[PDB]
């Protein structure tokens, strides 16, 4: 019913008035660890190649 998961982080929240309600601030160290898998297409192949 409930279990551990991959691709998740946890840290302390702190205020920021200067960004919208649908935005969220993340540290670079968390973002440099959690990954998202994009499928290559001829649109993004150059960007993914540089990446």
């Amino acid at each position: 019913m409930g279990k551990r998961v991959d691709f998740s982080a946890r840290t302390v929240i702190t205020p920021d008035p200067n960004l919208s309600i649908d935005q969220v601030g993340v540290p670079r160290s968390i973002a440099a660890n959690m990954t998202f898998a994009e499928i290559v297409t001829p649109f993004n192949i150059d960007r993914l190649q540089e990446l």
Partner: protein, 404 residues
């Protein structure tokens, strides 16, 4: 990403968000979104899940994204409102005697996202150009929205008598054709109640527009509050010393009225209320004197405060505190209760060893005739600790039943 604080009780505890990357090592979220999450920024932690498939990415973007989650189906209100500083400075901003110079107006207009680049004609053109805070808030409000609300300090007789549509106190908020005509905006206009201005914005206009309507209020009001400023201090809690004497006379007359009830009880001159025993009707009469005393001192305190007060600046705006907290800081803490009754005889027919046995007086059973500004006597301090302990227990006990 999806993003939650861990005691998830309703479906606004897991809401989608867009990622923005920032230098330091904490999660940062906007201050309205604190209200569904029940966040506190006092050492809270929140955990973030990243959706891995592109299909579930689209699913979160179309179902659980946060501006889509503004109005709940629990109680057909919005969940999010203006809070904690933007609300107080909104109330101070949209008052009738608020005037802005041309540089201040352009600095504030620099923080609107939904601005056409067109500067409105000021409310005063000569001797010198002056805009009004309502006139800028009319630029914040999107589309053509129409609503009518009332301010917290709106007097009841005013609608009955004359000056109904021209209010002397600048209450009765009226927004008409997307433009603030009149009124002062509090909790009852920008908060999370039904028929509030944000709710009309969500129903008449889309969720995407209401998102910008949140962010525009927060930016421009937090950038006006650098000019206005807002504090609290020890001067905010002090009184006239005409008020102090009135409070002391109220306490003295109530405390004498307790003693005469005790004398009528000892001389068997007290007849029991029907449906009650002699003990319960004695208790009822004593608590009636003490509660009427606390209310009268509280009302005297509330009448004493000035317009420039910073306790009143929050309670009128509804941002933080209540009308009993000001009375409990300035005038009288009150009676301390344990399980609805007074402080029980933990010793043999008395409470502490500093009291005579069979002392049903106010000071012997938990009433605190001192304020928080005046400090407490040690008996009253121990009784107030005994009062706070009960609620501190009930907080810990309540959770393991409510979650089950």
């Amino acid at each position: 990403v999806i993003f939650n604080r861990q005691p998830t009780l309703h479906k606004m505890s897991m809401m989608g968000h867009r990622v923005r990357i920032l230098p330091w090592s904490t999660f940062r979220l906007n201050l309205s979104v604190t209200t569904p999450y029940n966040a506190d920024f006092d050492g809270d932690e929140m955990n973030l899940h990243l959706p891995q498939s592109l299909e579930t990415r689209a699913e979160i973007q179309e179902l659980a994204m946060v501006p889509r989650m503004i109005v709940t189906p629990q109680s057909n209100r919005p969940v999010m409102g203006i809070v904690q500083d933007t609300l107080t400075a909104v109330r101070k901003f949209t008052k009738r005697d608020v005037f802005l110079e041309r540089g201040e107006v352009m600095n504030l207009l620099m923080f609107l996202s939904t601005w056409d680049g067109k500067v409105p004609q000021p409310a005063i053109l000569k001797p010198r150009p002056l805009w009004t805070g309502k006139q800028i808030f009319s630029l914040i409000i999107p589309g053509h929205i129409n609503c009518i609300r009332t301010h917290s300090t709106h007097p009841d007789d005013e609608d009955s008598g004359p000056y109904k549509h021209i209010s002397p106190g600048d209450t009765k908020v009226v927004v008409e054709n997307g433009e603030l005509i009149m009124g002062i905006l509090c909790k009852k206009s920008l908060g999370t109640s039904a028929g509030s201005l944000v709710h009309i914005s969500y129903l008449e206009m889309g969720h995407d527009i209401t998102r910008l309507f949140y962010s525009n209020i927060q930016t421009v009001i937090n950038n006006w509050l650098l000019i206005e400023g807002h504090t609290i201090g020890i001067g905010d809690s002090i009184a006239d010393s005409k008020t102090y004497q009135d409070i002391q006379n109220t306490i003295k007359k109530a405390k004498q009225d307790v003693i005469e009830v005790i004398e009528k009880a000892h001389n068997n001159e007290l007849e029991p209320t029907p449906g009650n025993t002699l003990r319960q009707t004695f208790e009822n009469q004593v608590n009636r004197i003490l509660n009427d005393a606390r209310d009268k001192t509280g009302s005297s305190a509330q009448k004493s405060l000035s317009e420039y007060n910073n306790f009143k600046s929050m309670v009128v705006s509804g941002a933080k505190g209540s009308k009993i907290n000001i009375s409990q800081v300035i005038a009288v803490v009150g009676q301390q209760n344990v399980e609805g009754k007074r402080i029980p005889f933990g010793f043999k027919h008395r409470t502490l060893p500093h009291f005579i046995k069979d002392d049903y007086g106010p000071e012997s059973r938990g009433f605190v005739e001192n304020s928080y500004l005046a400090g407490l006597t040690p008996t009253e301090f121990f009784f107030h600790a005994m009062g706070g302990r009960e609620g501190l227990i009930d907080t810990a006990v309540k959770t393991a039943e409510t979650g089950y």
